[PDB]
Amino acid sequence: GELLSKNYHLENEVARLKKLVDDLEDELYAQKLKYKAISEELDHALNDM
């Protein structure tokens, strides 16, 4: 019924949002690794110059 169908959709939406949080945090971590990499390359292209 209505109450239980609403419960089900809310549980799925909560799970969808938790996954999105975990995905964004992982993307933030990936980005942190990308940034140290490009930093060393900006330093290296100053030396290589």
Applying CB under 8 A, which residues contact its own copies? 3-4, 6-7, 10-11, 13-14, 17-18, 20-21, 24-25, 27-28, 31-32, 34-35, 38-39, 41-42, 45-46, 48-49
d(CA 16, CA 12): 6
Tell me which amino acid residue 45 is: A
22 binds, among its own copies, Mg ion, none (CB under 5 to 8 A by kind): Mg ion
d(CA 37, CA 48): 16
Nearer to Mg ion by Cβ, of 18 and 44: the residue is 18
